[PDB]
């Protein structure tokens, strides 16, 4: 018995906690941004959106989201905050988005 391929499993549970953590931030930031887009705060929503995006691409850097998955979440996020900003638009910061 006792293969030391078991080492692999020990590392699995390491990376599981790495991946799982960054995603949880992503979601918790993404929602946050949208919550202010719906609530018409433009500057704060865009400020948070830039941090969301940064966290997304940073998770693409490694083995969490590596593919165009990160680009998926970005796309959906920018669409949602722009459209939610369409209610009394006033895009104050205008940082994250294009003119």
Q: How far apart are CA 22 and CA 46, in angstroms?
A: 20
If the CB atoms of residues 41 and 92 are measured against RNA, the closer one turns out to be 92
| Token pair in block for residue 22 | 């960054």
Instruction: Please tell me the distance from the alpha carbon of residue 14 to that of residue 69, in angstroms, as a whole number.
Output: 22
Residues in 18-47 at the binding interface with Mg ion, rule: CB under 5 A = 28
- 75 touches Mg ion by CB under 5 A: no
d(CA 82, CA 91): 9
Partner interacting with residue 92 (select from RNA, Mg ion, none; CB below 5-8 Å by kind): none
Residue 28 touches which of RNA, Mg ion, none (Cβ within 5-8 Å per kind): Mg ion
Nearer to Mg ion, 28 or 68 (CB): 28
């Amino acid at each position: 018995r006792n293969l030391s391929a078991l080492k692999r499993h020990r590392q699995s549970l390491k990376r599981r906690l790495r991946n799982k953590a960054k995603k949880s931030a992503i979601k918790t930031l993404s929602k946050k941004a949208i919550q202010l887009a719906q609530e018409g705060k433009a500057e704060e929503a865009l400020k948070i959106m830039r941090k969301a995006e940064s966290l997304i691409d940073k998770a693409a850097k490694g083995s969490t989201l590596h593919k165009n998955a990160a680009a998926r979440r970005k796309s959906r996020l920018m669409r949602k905050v722009r459209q939610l900003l369409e209610a009394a638009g006033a895009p104050l910061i205008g940082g994250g988005l294009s003119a």
